[PDB]
Amino acid sequence: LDLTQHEIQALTMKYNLADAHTHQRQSASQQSIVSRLPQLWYEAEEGLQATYEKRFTEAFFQLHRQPTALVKNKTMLSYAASISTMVAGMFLKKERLAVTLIEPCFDNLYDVLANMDVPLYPIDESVFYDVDRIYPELERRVRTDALFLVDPNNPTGFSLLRHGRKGFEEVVRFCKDHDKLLLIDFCFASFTLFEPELARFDMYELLENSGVRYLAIEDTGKTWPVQDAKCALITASDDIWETVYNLHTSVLLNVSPFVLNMLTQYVRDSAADRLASVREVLTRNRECARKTLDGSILEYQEPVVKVSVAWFRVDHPELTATDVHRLLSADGVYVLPGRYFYWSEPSKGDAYVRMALAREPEMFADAMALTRQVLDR
Amino acid sequence: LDLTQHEIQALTMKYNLADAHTHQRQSASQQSIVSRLPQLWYEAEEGLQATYEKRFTEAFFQLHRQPTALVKNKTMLSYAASISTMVAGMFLKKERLAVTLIEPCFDNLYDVLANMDVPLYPIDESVFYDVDRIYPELERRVRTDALFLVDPNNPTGFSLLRHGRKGFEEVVRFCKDHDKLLLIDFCFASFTLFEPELARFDMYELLENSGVRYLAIEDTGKTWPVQDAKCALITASDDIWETVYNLHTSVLLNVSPFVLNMLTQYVRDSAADRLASVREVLTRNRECARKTLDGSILEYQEPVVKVSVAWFRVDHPELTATDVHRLLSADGVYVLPGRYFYWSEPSKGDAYVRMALAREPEMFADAMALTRQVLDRH
Numbered sequence A: 001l002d003l004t005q006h007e008i009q010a011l012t013m014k015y016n017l018a019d020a021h022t023h024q025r026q027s028a029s030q031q032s033i034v035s036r037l038p039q040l041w042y043e044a045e046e047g048l049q050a051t052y053e054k055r056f057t058e059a060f061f062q063l064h065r066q067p068t069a070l071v072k073n074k075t076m077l078s079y080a081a082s083i084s085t086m087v088a089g090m091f092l093k094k095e096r097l098a099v100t101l102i103e104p105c106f107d108n109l110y111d112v113l114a115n116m117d118v119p120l121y122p123i124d125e126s127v128f129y130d131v132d133r134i135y136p137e138l139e140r141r142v143r144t145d146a147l148f149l150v151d152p153n154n155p156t157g158f159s160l161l162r163h164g165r166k167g168f169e170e171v172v173r174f175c176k177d178h179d180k181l182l183l184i185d186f187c188f189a190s191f192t193l194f195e196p197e198l199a200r201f202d203m204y205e206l207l208e209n210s211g212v213r214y215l216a217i218e219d220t221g222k223t224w225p226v227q228d229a230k231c232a233l234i235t236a237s238d239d240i241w242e243t244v245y246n247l248h249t250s251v252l253l254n255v256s257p258f259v260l261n262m263l264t265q266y267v268r269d270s271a272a273d274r275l276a277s278v279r280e281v282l283t284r285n286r287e288c289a290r291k292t293l294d295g296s297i298l299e300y301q302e303p304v305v306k307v308s309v310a311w312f313r314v315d316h317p318e319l320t321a322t323d324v325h326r327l328l329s330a331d332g333v334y335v336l337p338g339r340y341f342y343w344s345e346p347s348k349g350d351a352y353v354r355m356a357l358a359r360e361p362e363m364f365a366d367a368m369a370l371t372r373q374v375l376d377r
Numbered sequence B: 001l002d003l004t005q006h007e008i009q010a011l012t013m014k015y016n017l018a019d020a021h022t023h024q025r026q027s028a029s030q031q032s033i034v035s036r037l038p039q040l041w042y043e044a045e046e047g048l049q050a051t052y053e054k055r056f057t058e059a060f061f062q063l064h065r066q067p068t069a070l071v072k073n074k075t076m077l078s079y080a081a082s083i084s085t086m087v088a089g090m091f092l093k094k095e096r097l098a099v100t101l102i103e104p105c106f107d108n109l110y111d112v113l114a115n116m117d118v119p120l121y122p123i124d125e126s127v128f129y130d131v132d133r134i135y136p137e138l139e140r141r142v143r144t145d146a147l148f149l150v151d152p153n154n155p156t157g158f159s160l161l162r163h164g165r166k167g168f169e170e171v172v173r174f175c176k177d178h179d180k181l182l183l184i185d186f187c188f189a190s191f192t193l194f195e196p197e198l199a200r201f202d203m204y205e206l207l208e209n210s211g212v213r214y215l216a217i218e219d220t221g222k223t224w225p226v227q228d229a230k231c232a233l234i235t236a237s238d239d240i241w242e243t244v245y246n247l248h249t250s251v252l253l254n255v256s257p258f259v260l261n262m263l264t265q266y267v268r269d270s271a272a273d274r275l276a277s278v279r280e281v282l283t284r285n286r287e288c289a290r291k292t293l294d295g296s297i298l299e300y301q302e303p304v305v306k307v308s309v310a311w312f313r314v315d316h317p318e319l320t321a322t323d324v325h326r327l328l329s330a331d332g333v334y335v336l337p338g339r340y341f342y343w344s345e346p347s348k349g350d351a352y353v354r355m356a357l358a359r360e361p362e363m364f365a366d367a368m369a370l371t372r373q374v375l376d377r378h
């Protein structure tokens, strides 16, 4: 059993607060994209595959303000971030690399690498909380030749961007100095964009300048309500690019140019409204959750980054997260118990619950009312 | 380098006859699906994921006449046949099994499995030509714990269905008797449907009844012009189903319900016209290729099944498929050399060329005229 199987069951329920996938409806301007889907289809039929790859990649890294990625122009597209992760797994296995992986994190990252026989060892997120302790903690704790981070992190919303540039600079300094491969999953990085103090800087400038061996994964699926018709992106350092390219081409020839055409519309639309239609739904549900559960047995854990998931600690002398999950699901509200996010030792997660916020606000507000009723015993 | 990289280049060219992916345009009735994409979007948005999975799986296995698969109801959906193959690869790696794999076959099957460190040993397609020799030839030549077939085969269009039920029954008898995991890629099986003598029987009835350990992969992307917005299916025998299920859920939670809803309309559309809009385009291009190249240095290899690719032998004392590819691409026509389809011994494939038929027939006819003009000055 894993979180994905919990999410399969939650997808049959009205109050599904489990999977982080986007289930809010379309904004007014996004309904305009839906209306042009026939034109987007016929356009992709007549044009060249590489044109739609280029236009998508350009729009994506323009919105994310990663100009270095567009100069190097070596990013590869796949169906989903887990597929990019499997390509990384093939590289890890070829090079006999074991991975020190962030904990907590969503469990399928562990599972898919473990299912490829990649040796995996945890490193706790708290190693990154104090910027001046990052490098010595990594020197003491990382004993593999690859380090896999998720930033911003799922489920906590933590980000090294709390430290400006310096948190990432210290991680990169460690990996370069010690000849480590740095893997980073940026799937939640869109939730930093347009933030006054947290907006992501050009990561690819730092990765390229440092000369570090790296694999960087980006995603669309958590940001936009595209019903999992999505694209992920992977970028490799120059010294491993050829090997990773050949691995990637064994998996797929191309992402659908129709999907790429459509996603480009969503990226451009969010450039125009500075991600308002994404951010506004999350803010309404996040605030509704905080206000409803303030003072309850579910203690909100404020995230560094306003990501699409909310993380709660269970404050009770006897009840665990397993009990809370059972009590809520009995009344029709499905959350994820924290145990699976502590993939190296699930018992560490029996004090946490994750709730998805990428939801229609009316349904979400009714889910919170029912949740509060259950927790009131 | 491999065939997919050849196909990346061909996608930039006017006469791309390389990748088997579908590039013909929409039929009149398929245009009515495209016109309803907004409706199909809102349906999936408001409906349940399991609803669109169920309706797609039902439509697919009704068209393919595999009712046993719907009774068992244990099939898992993924983004593409290669993703299903990687799940099978993870199973093969967990069990530390070596694979005997059909040769020739499209090279990314070999590459995906090799990139997961699965040991791979070839078995030539000719072992399946004589139905009464299949079992003793497998006894001699399958000395691994798994056997991986592609049926109908890509690039040759060969199928055990030439033997009715008996070819598959002999393969399954061997694998059951000798404790072999049987993997079968059925991605080209749509091209057998509604054929008076070749239409596929219920494969899952045979696989289930025999009790063989198996993994079976099905596909939509080679059949319909859906611009690679597609879905593959994998089904496992009962004894390994739980392990394979857990591997599969580590890869993805769900295929887009919008894509599933759209694909369901294409499946239903082709049930309505008995796949005529697919078959007629392929037949037009197949016949154009055959007539155009008759008597040339490219010798047409008639396939058992009318699949979406055509296979030719290079009939020349010196020129190779690599030479032919070089000469044709210099004039703008991009075909695939046979080399990488002979994944264990690529030089064997320098005797062959593959051409994709899932193309607009006007472009294709222009491509053949240019192809023969290039060939006849050599």
Ligand SMILES: CC1=C(O)\C(=C/N=C(\C=C\CNC(=N)N)C(=O)O)C(COP(=O)(O)O)=CN1
Binding pocket: A004, A007, A018, A019, A020, A021, A080, A081, A082, A083, A106, A108, A150, A154, A185, A187, A188, A221, B249, B250, B251, B252, B253
């Ligand atoms: C930071 C991050 C994720 O949070 C995440 C997925 N998180 C999920 C969904 C789970 C889907 N389950 C599987 N992919 N097996 C969540 O609920 O948090 C993935 C994988 O993305 P995708 O499913 O391949 O499109 C990559 N990076």
Ligand SMILES: CC1=C(O)\C(=C/N=C(\C=C\CNC(=N)N)C(=O)O)C(COP(=O)(O)O)=CN1
Binding pocket: A249, A250, A251, A252, A253, B004, B007, B018, B019, B020, B021, B080, B081, B082, B083, B106, B108, B150, B154, B185, B187, B188, B221
């Ligand atoms: C019998 C068969 C194939 O012929 C085939 C693909 N053949 C192709 C295109 C290959 C695209 N390249 C890669 N998938 N790496 C051809 O040109 O024949 C695949 C994989 O399908 P998909 O690309 O994952 O959608 C599975 N079973």
